[PDB]
Design a protein around this ligand. Sequence first.
Ligand code: CDL
Ligand code: CDL
Ligand code: CDL
Ligand code: CDL
Ligand code: PC1
Ligand code: PC1
Ligand code: PEE
Ligand code: LMT
Ligand code: LMT
Lengths: 110, 103, 54, 32, 59, 55, 74, 96, 145, 149, 51, 82, 51
Amino acid sequence: GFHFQQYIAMAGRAINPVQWTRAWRRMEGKSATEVYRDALAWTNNQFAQISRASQYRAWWWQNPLGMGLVLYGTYKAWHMIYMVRKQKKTAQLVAAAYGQGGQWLNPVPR
Amino acid sequence: FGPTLPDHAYYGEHATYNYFVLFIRGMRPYLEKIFGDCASTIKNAAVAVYRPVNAFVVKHNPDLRLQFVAFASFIATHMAITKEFNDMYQRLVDITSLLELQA
Amino acid sequence: SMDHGMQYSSIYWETSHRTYLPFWASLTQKFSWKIMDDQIRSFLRLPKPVTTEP
Amino acid sequence: VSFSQFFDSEYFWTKANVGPFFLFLFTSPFWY
Amino acid sequence: SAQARIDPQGAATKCVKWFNEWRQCAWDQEKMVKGYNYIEDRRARKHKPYIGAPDLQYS
Amino acid sequence: HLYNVDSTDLGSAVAPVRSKEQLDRVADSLKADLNLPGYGHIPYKWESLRPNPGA
Amino acid sequence: RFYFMYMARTTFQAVRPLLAFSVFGEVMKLVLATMSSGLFSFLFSFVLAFEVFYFFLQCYISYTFLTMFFTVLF
Amino acid sequence: PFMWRQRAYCAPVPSAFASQQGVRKPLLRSNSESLSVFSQIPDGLLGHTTSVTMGNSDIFFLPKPSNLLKIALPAFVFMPNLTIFTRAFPFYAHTS
Amino acid sequence: QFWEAQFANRSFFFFGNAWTSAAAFAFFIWWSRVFDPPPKERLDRYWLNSPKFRILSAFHNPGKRPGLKISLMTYEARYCYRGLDHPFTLNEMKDFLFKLREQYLVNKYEGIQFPFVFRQFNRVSTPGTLEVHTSPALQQQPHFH
Amino acid sequence: PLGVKGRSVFAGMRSFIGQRLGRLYDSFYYSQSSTKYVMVFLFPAGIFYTRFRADTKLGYHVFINEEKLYPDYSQNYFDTKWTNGRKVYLDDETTVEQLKAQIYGGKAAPENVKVACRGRVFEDADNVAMAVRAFCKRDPRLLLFQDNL
Amino acid sequence: HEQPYRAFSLGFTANNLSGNWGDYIDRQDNKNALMRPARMMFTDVFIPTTK
Amino acid sequence: STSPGLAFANLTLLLDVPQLPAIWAVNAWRELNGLFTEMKTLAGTSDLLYPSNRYNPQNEKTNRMGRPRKYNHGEWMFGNSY
Amino acid sequence: YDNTASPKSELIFMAGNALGYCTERFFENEYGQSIFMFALGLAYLAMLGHE
Ligand SMILES: CCCCCCCCCCCCCCCCCC(=O)OC[C@H](COP(=O)([O-])OCC(O)COP(=O)([O-])OC[C@@H](COC(=O)CCCCCCCCCCCCCCCCC)OC(=O)CCCCCCCCCCCCCCCCC)OC(=O)CCCCCCCCCCCCCCCCC
Ligand SMILES: CCCCCCCCCCCCCCCCCC(=O)OC[C@H](COP(=O)([O-])OCC(O)COP(=O)([O-])OC[C@@H](COC(=O)CCCCCCCCCCCCCCCCC)OC(=O)CCCCCCCCCCCCCCCCC)OC(=O)CCCCCCCCCCCCCCCCC
Ligand SMILES: CCCCCCCCCCCCCCCCCC(=O)OC[C@H](COP(=O)([O-])OCC(O)COP(=O)([O-])OC[C@@H](COC(=O)CCCCCCCCCCCCCCCCC)OC(=O)CCCCCCCCCCCCCCCCC)OC(=O)CCCCCCCCCCCCCCCCC
Ligand SMILES: CCCCCCCCCCCCCCCCCC(=O)OC[C@H](COP(=O)([O-])OCC(O)COP(=O)([O-])OC[C@@H](COC(=O)CCCCCCCCCCCCCCCCC)OC(=O)CCCCCCCCCCCCCCCCC)OC(=O)CCCCCCCCCCCCCCCCC
Ligand SMILES: CCCCCCCCCCCCCCCCCC(=O)OC[C@H](COP(=O)([O-])OCC[N+](C)(C)C)OC(=O)CCCCCCCCCCCCCCCCC
Ligand SMILES: CCCCCCCCCCCCCCCCCC(=O)OC[C@H](COP(=O)([O-])OCC[N+](C)(C)C)OC(=O)CCCCCCCCCCCCCCCCC
Ligand SMILES: CCCCCCCC/C=C/CCCCCCCC(=O)OC[C@H](COP(=O)(O)OCCN)OC(=O)CCCCCCC/C=C/CCCCCCCC
Ligand SMILES: CCCCCCCCCCCCO[C@@H]1O[C@H](CO)[C@@H](O[C@H]2O[C@H](CO)[C@@H](O)[C@H](O)[C@H]2O)[C@H](O)[C@H]1O
Ligand SMILES: CCCCCCCCCCCCO[C@@H]1O[C@H](CO)[C@@H](O[C@H]2O[C@H](CO)[C@@H](O)[C@H](O)[C@H]2O)[C@H](O)[C@H]1O
């Protein structure tokens, strides 16, 4: 893993509306195949940088588990930021519709 | 009274050169013909359906921005019509719920 | 003293319980073929239910 | 093309297009 | 048995089930006397959950 | 005198025609007759840019 | 009867890790819910680590028995 | 129809004892109607509520990076090979 | 690759332990019926009491309580598609009436919550000066001895 | 070289079926008499009968209220005593009288014997299938009792 | 064959067999007595009461 | 060949593949019964026949549930009472 | 009423009834979708190991 700060900055630029107009202008004379190939090439460049530079270079976060810990941290951040938020919303929804635990209730007895 | 059965009646066939593998390797050509013809038919049909549509779309939306605009407008129109139908059904359901409240 | 009551029980989600909702669920919406079916029946003169007769 | 000269082995396995025939054969339950 | 003379509500709480069964039997007897039936739909494609399962026939 | 009616008109001999306006009218009449404070109240709504998530 | 014996053995060897992960986990969770002090927690951390090692041991055993039970000559 | 003061579920509603109220609503109703679902409420949309369907939402996609791996992995056997020793299968299936 | 494996020994369709065998077994169980949705005659066996079903119904009816409509869907599944003239027993009838009463109370009293109806929500309306007092002791009832 | 001129794929199918049948006959001939007859005729036949009866006919679980009403199965073999809960397969035209006679072995049955399902008495001149459909839908458990009252 | 089934959930992460939530009317706490005071510890999110 | 882990599949096969002929026979019998019912319907019937129903006992002297028809002793100007 | 015996010849329906129960309870619902994904994952892992 690497360039997390650059990724945050990319997300910021993406949400900035002015960049929406800039991208609208850049998309003049452009194809979906070209856009897809460019994105795929960017991702491949990132992963190739990793594969090459891990052989001789060590980041500030280097540890006896290597990039496994950084990847687990990315996963855990994604989890706590998105999935647990969705769980909170679903919990409030279920509590308003059926009551807390309503989705695990037993079938009506016959 | 002696043996009445031969050896092949009991012993298992060859492990690597067996009846079914020989049979299927003999049938391979006919199966190739069959499945290739079926796949070619399906592919030709799909292509005859896709080429004119892609042409008619690119003829009117040759650029990526225009294609995205058309896709978004299609999504919006679909959602709006679905919303109209759903509003009607929701009015029916609301009447039923009001009658339940009245009961 | 029954209206506008306080939250009397706690709301929570147990660990690793599933939600069954994707990220486009809010854009998803329901639909019934009943309205279209009624229109089509009326247009094609298909058998009507007896509930049409009082 | 005639029924007999189509279902002849040579023409059926060399020159004919049995794609539609075998597709209909596979989908028979649907049509029934 | 539940002493409805002195506990009518408590006893009805126990006997309403037999009352409901009697109601159902009344409807059943009426529909058998006056021939009342309905068009049943064809058999569903997945009437059996598993092909090897037996489809016990019910009247 | 043999029937439980106020007048001699027992209504139309044909069912009504589907109409958004008639549906709204009937619903409003029922709401007014019920007079229930709490109809339409939404204690929790799924947080979304869309006004009605789902429906 | 051999089919029933075999399926019983297979299911037991397949669920062994699930048991080690779920029921002993419930026990650990009871202990966590009941304990408050620091000395007992210091001593219980090692029990948790032992449960980790025991889970891995059960997984190894199950892998062995399953590769034995799903090995076919032909 | 035997123990009226003891069987209140089969008795008229209290609005019937009141002697006051196109077509009008019935004057006599029983409490036994509470044992029916569609007694008072209508049967509208009765057999059409199980027809409102919504599709599933699972996506079957997972990148398969094999350049990361250099060893084989174990694989299960799902069915017995009936293409070999077909005639003896019922006789040797119980062995190991 | 998959086609070539068919003619190799021990890798025909779902026999063997190759990847092609796993893929063909997956396609076979998909082509089978066991993983298809149940019919209307069988919905109330598992589906109508399912967490996925309940959560989806609640989500797609944002500010409503679908317990009553679910009871009615069960009644339908049993009456109109299985042939049962009496789908509800006494317990199911009581459950239906309970849900009806809860609907009435929810639409009658604005903001009613758990103790009186099975419902909880966080954003509540409070007076502004909320007093806290101890409840009175339970009423002494007369008893023998 | 696939196929030959003048020959038909149907002729090929016929030849293949002939080959298969001849091979089957040869393999059945050169086999053990202890196993082949059983595995090829008796298990298939019994399985076929059972599956067909279950998937075609409709059965009922019969019970009897009192022991004094049990039939006399002392003579007939393989069943020397009545057991409640017995599965009985019947035809769609069967009546309550025919069922009673089948239960009591065409012999003199007790007096005022009647059939019930879920507490509901059947008439003797009633079709069992339709009576069950009406009274106990998908619960065919029948009970034989004595109606003196 | 006419009685309905209860939902099934089983995995390495969660299940629905260690407890019972009850019916829609007659409900019961799914956690047992020893861990009810520590219910917070068995949740990914917890929204407390208003008091 | 086989193995202990394949006991499920072995049992399922041994107990199910012999039933497929009977299943196909049941399907064929159902088709033939439907064909005969439709032929009879085309020929004609006093009272209707429910196709997908198990049993149809209705006739001139029997209800659609196996009971005698009420009010069927005399004759009616409009013909059949059904 | 629950002593409903059945002919001993119907023991051949053992596996059929087992699979039918497992279908009505697990396979034709969300847990069955999870099981299908598990099978797809077995295929995925076999392919990964071969490569
Ligand atoms: C709160 C933590 C808990 C989070 C939630 C729980 C989640 C649990 C799951 C955890 C998963 C972790 C994700 C792992 C994936 C890999 C991530 C990664 O390695 O790269 C991260 C990324 C590093 O990017 P990079 O690609 O490695 O490039 C490095 C640059 O070249 C720069 O080069 P450099 O050489 O100059 O420095 C290299 C590196 C150096 O990083 C270090 O080595 C750490 C230095 C101190 C050592 C001790 C660390 C712990 C104690 C002090 C720090 C407290 C904050 C916790 C930081 C946790 C991460 C170590 O720089 C940093 O990462 C700075 C991080 C510290 C920012 C402090 C901001 C303070 C605001 C919060 C108030 C104070 C804390 C409140 C108490 C919180 C208690 C939990 O760090 C950033 O966050 C970038 C920030 C960009 C500017 C954003 C605007 C400022 C906002 C500040 C907050 C930024 C977000 C951090 C949130 C935490 C603070 C609230
Ligand atoms: C140790 C054991 C080993 C043996 C294995 C044994 C097991 C074998 C059998 C297999 C296992 C079967 C077990 C049964 C499964 C049943 C349970 C289940 O599956 O669901 C439970 C679980 C329950 O969730 P739930 O609450 O019930 O909700 C269920 C919903 O249906 C689903 O919830 P959802 O829809 O909300 O979640 C989907 C999620 C994720 O969905 C997706 O993203 C779609 C997937 C696309 C993947 C390809 C894109 C990758 C992009 C990477 C590029 C990043 C930058 C590069 C940086 C490089 C440096 C780091 O969506 C989001 O969170 C937001 C993303 C929205 C955007 C997605 C579309 C755009 C994609 C392109 C990005 C464009 C960004 C533009 C931004 C806008 C700018 C204007 O389901 C999930 O959590 C679903 C997500 C799971 C993700 C797990 C994260 C780890 C993934 C890695 C897995 C391992 C990888 C191995 C190596 C291969 C990768 C290298
Ligand atoms: C470092 C890695 C990169 C980080 C950046 C990744 C995030 C990029 C997205 C940025 C945009 C965010 C939007 C901001 C505007 C406000 C909206 C909003 O935020 O609400 C969304 C949500 C809350 O939503 P809500 O409260 O329910 O209310 C409205 C709904 O959201 C919305 O209303 P709705 O429900 O009606 O909308 C429904 C539908 C609307 O959307 C859709 O229908 C579809 C959207 C998908 C579009 C797909 C792209 C389209 C592509 C078209 C082109 C295709 C062809 C070309 C591409 C080919 C591909 C090869 O679905 C969605 O809403 C999708 C929303 C997805 C949310 C983002 C999921 C990512 C979560 C964070 C992942 C963190 C990874 C680890 C970070 C590691 C850092 C150490 O909140 C967030 O998502 C939070 C985002 C936070 C980003 C954090 C970045 C890392 C910073 C680390 C800080 C350190 C502390 C963190 C703790 C852990 C430390 C270790
Ligand atoms: C009456 C009698 C009845 C008796 C009972 C009968 C029972 C019924 C009949 C049974 C019939 C038998 C049928 C068979 C049994 C059925 C089993 C079944 O269906 O399952 C149901 C059951 C689930 O059903 P359920 O109802 O949905 O349960 C609730 C949910 O599961 C709850 O979900 P959750 O909230 O807990 O969330 C879980 C979460 C869990 O998510 C995770 O665990 C992922 C964590 C990843 C962290 C690190 C990711 C780093 C990747 C970074 C990528 C680049 C950056 C991109 C950034 C974004 C992505 C981070 O989501 C997932 O599960 C994702 C799964 C999909 C992805 C699978 C990935 C497979 C990859 C395999 C890799 C193989 C490598 C081999 C290398 C060998 C060594 C050389 O199965 C489970 O137990 C679920 C858990 C399964 C475990 C999966 C763990 C995979 C972890 C892979 C880690 C790889 C790392 C390797 C590192 C080592 C090398 C350094
Ligand atoms: C319908 C769903 C099927 C899906 C699963 C099956 C896989 C899908 C692919 C098709 C399956 C069939 C492939 C057959 C390949 C054999 C081709 C061949 O040439 O074989 C040699 C035969 C014999 O040829 P021949 O010996 O007469 O002359 C040629 C001689 N040589 C080979 C030396 C040159 O050729 C044929 O006549 C064609 C036979 C195939 C046509 C029949 C299909 C068989 C499947 C049905 C089995 C039941 C048969 C009875 C049917 C009765 C109909 C009323
Ligand atoms: C998705 C489904 C996938 C699964 C595949 C499903 C389709 C394929 C399933 C096949 C697997 C099951 C195959 C098991 C076959 C076992 C049957 C068997 O072999 O029989 C036992 C006998 C046993 O013979 P045996 O006892 O001598 O030896 C058996 C093995 N040992 C030596 C170990 C004991 O087999 C035969 O000898 C004959 C077999 C061929 C005949 C098959 C039956 C048809 C016979 C018709 C001819 C009738 C002629 C009558 C003439 C009378 C006058 C003489
Ligand atoms: C830890 C031990 C776990 C072992 C569990 C593994 C179970 C393996 C058993 C499943 C295979 C059994 C073979 C059944 C064949 C029955 C005879 C037959 O040919 O019937 C065909 C019949 C298809 O007929 P139709 O449905 O009518 O087709 C309609 C087409 N639209 O086949 C079937 O029904 C498919 C049967 C599905 C079996 C159940 C699937 C269980 C899921 C297992 C995968 C999960 C992983 C299992 C662990 C792997 C163990 C090696
Ligand atoms: C298929 C079996 C293999 C997979 C195992 C799946 C996980 C097993 C579940 C956890 C086992 C322990 O479960 C634990 O004991 C029972 C479970 O009913 C519960 O105990 C609770 O229910 C029982 C009912 O029998 C009551 O007697 C008890 O008073 C009550 O506290 C506990 O709340 C739970 O913590
Ligand atoms: C030589 C005879 C024909 C041989 C080929 C037989 C193939 C039959 C299997 C096809 C699948 C049948 O699966 C199912 O069974 C019968 C038709 O058979 C139908 O069953 C339904 O229609 C038939 C009419 O024939 C009615 O008799 C029956 O009461 C009704 O339930 C179902 O609608 C169908 O879904």
